[PDB]
């Protein structure tokens, strides 16, 4: 059970960290093009 | 040891859920403001 929990925790942590990185990158895209549109306006 | 890993698994699952819903909501907000700013431009 312990090894199964280690595997599942590793998978969940990797998925969550990838979701953090996804949110941060898409927010960076957002801030960049938000600066672009704000500059154009 | 088992309880700590189970807690970490629950935390990772909740983190993934909250970040996936956050991803949907932030994408929605972003799409909305892109359309709005383009209209203003």
UniProtKB/Swiss-Prot annotation, chains A, B:
It comes from the Eukaryota. It is found in: Cytoplasm, Cytoskeleton; Cytoplasm, Cytoskeleton, Microtubule organizing center, Centrosome. A motif (CC1 box) lies at residues 12-16. Highly expressed during early embryonic development. Predominantly expressed in kidney, undifferentiated neural tissue and developing eye. Part of a tripartite complex with dynein and dynactin, acts an adapter linking the dynein motor complex and dynactin. Interacts with KIF1C. Interacts with RAB6A and RAB6B; interaction is specific to Rab6. Belongs to the BICDR family. Acts as an adapter protein linking the dynein motor complex to various cargos and converts dynein from a non-processive to a highly processive motor in the presence of dynactin. Facilitates the interaction between dynein and dynactin and activates dynein processivity (the ability to move along a microtubule for a long distance without falling off the track). Predominantly recruits 2 dyneins, which increases both the force and speed of the microtubule motor. Component of secretory vesicle machinery in developing neurons that acts as a regulator of neurite outgrowth. This is BICD family-like cargo adapter 1.
């Amino acid at each position: 059970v312990i090894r199964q929990k280690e595997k599942d925790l590793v998978l969940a942590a990797r998925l969550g960290k990838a979701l953090l990185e996804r949110n941060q990158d898409m927010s960076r895209q957002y801030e960049q093009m938000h600066k672009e549109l704000t500059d154009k306006l």
